[PDB]
């Protein structure tokens, strides 16, 4: 459970958009819940400008009563003295707008957004995200019109936790445009969450386990992550 080779803020987006709050008038555009319980594969390339990149693949699905996110992450071409491997990022997380568009060929969606990480010297470290989600099951899914997800996040610590860890609380709401899918109805209450990540960045291997709960009615995620 040693210290991660990368800053916790750089892993936030990799570490379950099915918990976003879709307002009633937009429920017909919620691909993420409609893919449940069989779930979807979520893949990203995250390009840290003037530095390296992460490539991720995750399976997000229900196991029993729990929404599970299992991720493999590979980071390459990082500068050992850069903002990421040098741990120069502040422990906070700005609001993002995640822009979503349908990918009819793959019966899924794509998403694009650029995260701004605050650097300890007042500069900014950009992380450009390219994302694609493909449903695992064969059933019908909701393919959305163009819209975005607006996010808000607080990062904190557990004063009694000796391991390297991150406590996270986030609220996400859809914007920019009865149940609309069967999968939507799996999110009506509070749902337990398990996150497992295996990572390798420039050959530095690490793993993260997270547990918590999500409440999609209000777009809320609360989780605690530990380096394992």
Coordinates of C-alpha atoms in Angstrom, one line a residue:
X1 CA 0.0 0.0 0.0
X2 CA 2.9 2.3 -0.7
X3 CA 2.7 5.8 -2.3
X4 CA 1.3 5.9 -5.8
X5 CA 3.8 6.8 -8.6
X6 CA 1.3 9.3 -9.9
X7 CA -0.9 11.9 -8.2
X8 CA -4.3 10.9 -7.0
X9 CA -6.1 13.7 -9.0
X10 CA -4.8 12.2 -12.3
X11 CA -6.7 8.9 -11.6
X12 CA -10.1 10.4 -10.7
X13 CA -11.6 10.2 -14.1
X14 CA -10.4 6.6 -14.6
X15 CA -11.7 5.5 -11.1
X16 CA -18.9 5.0 -13.2
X17 CA -20.9 7.5 -15.2
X18 CA -24.0 5.4 -14.7
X19 CA -24.4 7.4 -11.4
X20 CA -24.9 10.7 -13.2
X21 CA -28.2 12.5 -12.5
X22 CA -30.2 12.7 -15.8
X23 CA -33.0 15.2 -15.3
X24 CA -36.5 13.8 -16.1
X25 CA -36.7 15.5 -19.5
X26 CA -33.3 13.9 -20.5
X27 CA -33.8 10.4 -19.3
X28 CA -34.1 9.0 -22.8
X29 CA -30.4 10.0 -23.3
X30 CA -28.9 8.0 -20.5
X31 CA -26.8 5.3 -22.3
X32 CA -24.9 4.3 -19.2
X33 CA -27.8 3.0 -17.1
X34 CA -29.5 1.5 -20.1
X35 CA -26.5 -0.9 -20.6
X36 CA -27.0 -2.4 -17.2
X37 CA -26.8 -5.0 -15.7
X38 CA -24.5 -6.5 -18.3
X39 CA -22.6 -3.3 -18.5
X40 CA -20.2 -1.7 -20.9
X41 CA -16.6 -1.5 -21.8
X42 CA -15.1 2.0 -21.3
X43 CA -11.8 2.8 -23.0
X44 CA -9.8 6.0 -22.9
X45 CA -6.7 7.7 -24.1
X46 CA -5.7 10.5 -21.6
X47 CA -3.0 12.8 -23.1
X48 CA -1.1 14.8 -20.5
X49 CA 0.1 17.8 -22.5
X50 CA 3.9 18.2 -22.7
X51 CA 4.1 14.8 -20.9
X52 CA 3.0 11.2 -21.2
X53 CA -0.4 9.4 -21.7
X54 CA -2.6 6.9 -20.0
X55 CA -4.5 4.2 -22.0
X56 CA -7.3 2.5 -20.0
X57 CA -9.8 -0.3 -20.5
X58 CA -12.5 -0.9 -17.9
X59 CA -15.4 -3.3 -17.5
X60 CA -18.4 -1.6 -15.7
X61 CA -21.2 -4.0 -14.7
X62 CA -23.4 -5.2 -11.8
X63 CA -22.3 -8.1 -9.7
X64 CA -25.1 -8.9 -7.3
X65 CA -26.1 -5.7 -5.6
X66 CA -22.8 -4.0 -6.4
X67 CA -21.8 -1.8 -9.3
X68 CA -18.2 -2.9 -10.2
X69 CA -15.6 -0.9 -12.2
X70 CA -12.5 -3.0 -13.0
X71 CA -9.7 -1.1 -14.9
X72 CA -6.4 -1.8 -16.5
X73 CA -4.2 1.3 -17.0
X74 CA -1.0 1.7 -18.9
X75 CA 0.9 5.0 -18.8
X76 CA 3.8 5.7 -21.2
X77 CA 6.3 8.4 -22.1
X78 CA 6.1 10.4 -18.9
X79 CA 8.9 12.7 -17.8
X80 CA 10.4 11.5 -14.5
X81 CA 10.7 15.2 -13.4
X82 CA 7.3 16.3 -14.9
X83 CA 4.2 17.3 -13.1
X84 CA 2.9 13.7 -12.9
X85 CA 5.8 11.5 -11.9
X86 CA 7.2 14.5 -9.9
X87 CA 4.0 14.9 -7.9
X88 CA 3.5 18.6 -8.6
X89 CA -0.3 18.7 -8.7
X90 CA -2.6 20.2 -6.1
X91 CA -5.0 17.9 -4.2
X92 CA -8.2 19.2 -5.6
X93 CA -10.3 18.8 -8.8
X94 CA -12.0 21.4 -10.9
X95 CA -15.4 21.2 -12.5
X96 CA -15.5 19.6 -16.0
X97 CA -18.1 19.4 -18.8
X98 CA -17.9 15.9 -20.4
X99 CA -19.3 16.2 -24.0
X100 CA -21.1 13.0 -25.1
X101 CA -22.1 11.9 -28.6
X102 CA -23.7 8.8 -30.0
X103 CA -21.6 6.2 -31.8
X104 CA -24.3 4.3 -33.7
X105 CA -21.9 1.9 -35.4
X106 CA -20.7 0.5 -32.1
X107 CA -24.2 0.9 -30.5
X108 CA -22.5 3.1 -27.9
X109 CA -21.1 6.6 -27.2
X110 CA -17.9 8.6 -27.4
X111 CA -16.9 11.4 -25.1
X112 CA -14.4 14.3 -25.1
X113 CA -13.1 16.7 -22.5
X114 CA -9.9 18.4 -21.3
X115 CA -9.2 18.3 -17.5
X116 CA -7.2 21.1 -16.0
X117 CA -5.0 19.9 -13.1
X118 CA -3.8 22.7 -10.8
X119 CA 0.0 22.7 -10.5
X120 CA 1.6 23.8 -7.2
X121 CA 3.3 26.7 -8.9
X122 CA 0.1 28.3 -10.2
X123 CA 0.4 26.8 -13.7
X124 CA -1.9 24.2 -15.2
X125 CA -1.4 20.7 -16.4
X126 CA -3.9 19.6 -19.2
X127 CA -5.2 16.1 -19.5
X128 CA -7.0 15.7 -22.8
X129 CA -9.5 12.8 -22.7
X130 CA -10.8 10.7 -25.6
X131 CA -13.4 8.1 -24.4
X132 CA -15.5 5.4 -26.1
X133 CA -18.1 3.1 -24.4
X134 CA -19.5 -0.1 -26.0
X135 CA -22.3 -2.1 -24.4
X136 CA -21.6 -5.7 -23.5
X137 CA -25.1 -7.1 -23.8
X138 CA -27.1 -7.6 -27.0
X139 CA -30.3 -5.8 -25.8
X140 CA -31.4 -2.3 -26.8
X141 CA -29.6 0.6 -25.3
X142 CA -30.4 4.3 -25.4
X143 CA -28.3 6.2 -27.9
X144 CA -28.2 9.9 -26.9
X145 CA -28.4 13.2 -28.7
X146 CA -25.4 15.4 -28.1
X147 CA -25.2 16.6 -24.5
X148 CA -22.8 16.9 -21.6
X149 CA -22.2 16.0 -18.0
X150 CA -21.3 18.8 -15.5
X151 CA -19.2 17.7 -12.6
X152 CA -18.3 18.9 -9.1
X153 CA -15.7 17.2 -6.8
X154 CA -14.2 17.3 -3.4
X155 CA -11.0 15.4 -2.5
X156 CA -10.1 14.8 1.2
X157 CA -8.3 12.4 3.6
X158 CA -9.2 10.0 6.3
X159 CA -7.3 11.1 9.4
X160 CA -7.2 7.5 10.6
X161 CA -5.9 5.9 7.4
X162 CA -2.2 5.2 7.3
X163 CA -2.2 3.9 3.7
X164 CA -1.9 6.2 0.7
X165 CA -5.5 6.9 -0.1
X166 CA -8.1 9.3 -1.5
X167 CA -11.5 10.2 -0.1
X168 CA -13.8 11.4 -2.9
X169 CA -17.2 13.0 -3.1
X170 CA -18.6 14.0 -6.5
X171 CA -21.9 15.3 -8.0
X172 CA -22.6 14.9 -11.7
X173 CA -25.6 16.2 -13.6
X174 CA -26.5 15.9 -17.3
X175 CA -27.4 19.1 -19.3
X176 CA -27.4 20.5 -22.8
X177 CA -30.7 19.2 -24.2
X178 CA -41.5 7.1 -16.0
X179 CA -38.4 5.1 -16.6
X180 CA -36.8 5.3 -20.0
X181 CA -34.9 2.0 -19.8
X182 CA -35.1 -1.1 -17.6
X183 CA -31.5 -0.5 -16.5
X184 CA -32.4 2.9 -15.2
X185 CA -34.5 1.3 -12.5
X186 CA -31.5 -0.5 -11.0
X187 CA -30.3 2.9 -9.8
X188 CA -33.4 4.1 -7.9
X189 CA -31.8 3.9 -4.4
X190 CA -28.3 3.9 -2.9
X191 CA -26.1 1.4 -4.7
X192 CA -22.8 0.0 -3.3
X193 CA -19.7 0.4 -5.6
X194 CA -16.5 -1.5 -5.9
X195 CA -13.5 -0.2 -8.0
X196 CA -10.4 -2.2 -8.8
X197 CA -7.5 -0.7 -10.8
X198 CA -4.2 -2.3 -11.9
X199 CA -1.8 0.2 -13.3
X200 CA 1.7 0.5 -14.8
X201 CA 3.1 4.0 -15.5
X202 CA 6.6 4.0 -17.1
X203 CA 7.1 0.6 -15.5
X204 CA 6.0 1.7 -12.0
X205 CA 3.3 -0.8 -11.1
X206 CA 0.5 -0.1 -8.6
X207 CA -3.0 -1.1 -7.7
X208 CA -6.0 0.8 -6.2
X209 CA -9.1 -0.6 -4.5
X210 CA -12.1 1.7 -3.9
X211 CA -15.4 1.1 -2.1
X212 CA -18.4 3.4 -1.5
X213 CA -21.9 4.1 -2.8
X214 CA -23.7 6.0 -5.5
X215 CA -27.1 7.8 -5.5
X216 CA -28.0 8.5 -9.1
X217 CA -31.2 10.3 -8.1
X218 CA -29.0 13.2 -6.9
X219 CA -26.0 12.4 -9.0
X220 CA -23.8 11.6 -5.9
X221 CA -20.7 9.4 -5.6
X222 CA -18.9 8.8 -2.3
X223 CA -15.9 6.6 -2.3
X224 CA -12.7 5.8 -0.5
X225 CA -9.7 4.6 -2.5
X226 CA -6.6 2.9 -1.1
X227 CA -3.3 2.0 -2.7
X228 CA -3.0 -1.8 -2.5

